[PDB]
Amino acid sequence: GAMVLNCTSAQFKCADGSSCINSRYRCDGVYDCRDNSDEAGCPTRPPG
Numbered sequence: 606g607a608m609v610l611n612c613t614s615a616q617f618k619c620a621d622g623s624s625c626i627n628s629r630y631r632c633d634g635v636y637d638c639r640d641n642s643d644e645a646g647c648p649t650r651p652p653g
């Protein structure tokens with residue numbers, strides 16, 4: 606919990622909680638979290 610950021614229930618909190626990003630920034634290609642938990646907890650190579 607290194608500098609826990611405050612977000613809503615809709616927004617995605619990082620694994621450590623150090624940052625919050627949008628739910629629209631879950632699964633896009635880039636890494637928005639402190640590590641990469643935003644795309645780690647995401648479908649592994651989406652079919653289509």
Ligand SMILES: [Ca+2]
Nearest residue numbers: 630635637643
């Ligand atoms: Ca992302």
